[PDB]
A paper describes a structure:
The R2TP complex is found in organisms from yeast to humans, and consists of the AAA+ ATPases Rvb1 and Rvb2 (human: RUVBL1 and RUVBL2), a TPR-containing protein, Tah1 (human: Spagh or RPAP3), and Pih1 (also known as NOP17 and Pih1D1, but referred to as Pih1 henceforth; Kakihara and Houry, 2012; Te et al., 2007). The biological roles ascribed to the R2TP complex are directly associated with its ability to interact with the Hsp90 chaperone system and function as an Hsp90 cochaperone (Boulon et al., 2010; Izumi et al., 2012; Takai et al., 2010). Here we present crystal structures of Hsp90-Tah1-Pih1, Hsp90-Spagh/RPAP3, and Pih1-Tel2 complexes that together define key structural links within the R2TP core in yeast and in animals and reveal how R2TP connects the Hsp90 chaperone system to the TTT complex involved in PIKK activation.
Interaction with Tel2 involves the N-terminal segment of Pih1 (Horejsí et al., 2010), which contains a conserved region of unknown structure (henceforth, PIH domain). We also obtained crystals of an essentially identical region of budding yeast Pih128–184 and determined the structure of this with molecular replacement. An additional α helix connecting strands 2 and 3 projects from the end of the sheet and packs against the larger of the other two helices.
Author numbering: 28 to 184
């Protein structure tokens, strides 16, 4: 059974595509946008966010904010050049944690970049990075199709 997660727009990561080694063709050097968004349907860490507890767990690879990433979609800039867009959906509580702790927000941004890199075999720039003041890139964020074992425990069947 496939469930739908309708993400709530939050903020955008702007970057650059350095290389594409995946099953599909992408143009190197094109602008990349990542929509960091949220839903209460995304799993969340079992350990509540407390900086002194959690940052050592992150170093130990024992704690992470779960991310559900969409397939990429194409948009175009004003000169007609292709730009690639991904949605990275996290639990709504985790979206509030990254408001109050800038160190956690930086790590979450890195996790979102790695998530797109993993799912589509792309390499994204860590230097040519920006944070547009918009909530999302593009029109309505499309629904994420997920299996029931991917949902937050309290929202499973």
């Amino acid at each position: 059974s496939v469930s739908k997660i309708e993400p709530i727009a939050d903020f955008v990561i702007k970057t650059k595509l350095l290389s594409a080694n995946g099953p599909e063709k992408l143009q190197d050097g094109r602008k990349v946008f990542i929509n960091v968004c949220h839903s209460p349907l995304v799993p969340k860490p079992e350990v509540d966010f407390n900086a002194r507890i959690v940052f050592p767990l992150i170093i130990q690879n024992e704690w992470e904010i779960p991310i559900i990433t969409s397939c990429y979609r194409m948009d175009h800039d004003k000169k007609g050049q292709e730009c690639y867009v991904w949605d990275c959906c996290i639990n709504s509580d985790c979206s509030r944690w990254i408001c109050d702790d800038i160190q956690l927000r930086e790590i979450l941004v890195e996790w979102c970049l790695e998530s797109c890199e993993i799912r589509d075999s792309v390499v994204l720039c860590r230097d040519r990075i920006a944070f547009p003041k918009m909530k999302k890139k593009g029109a309505e964020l499309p629904a994420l199709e997920v299996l029931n074992d991917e949902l937050h425990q309290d929202y499973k069947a």
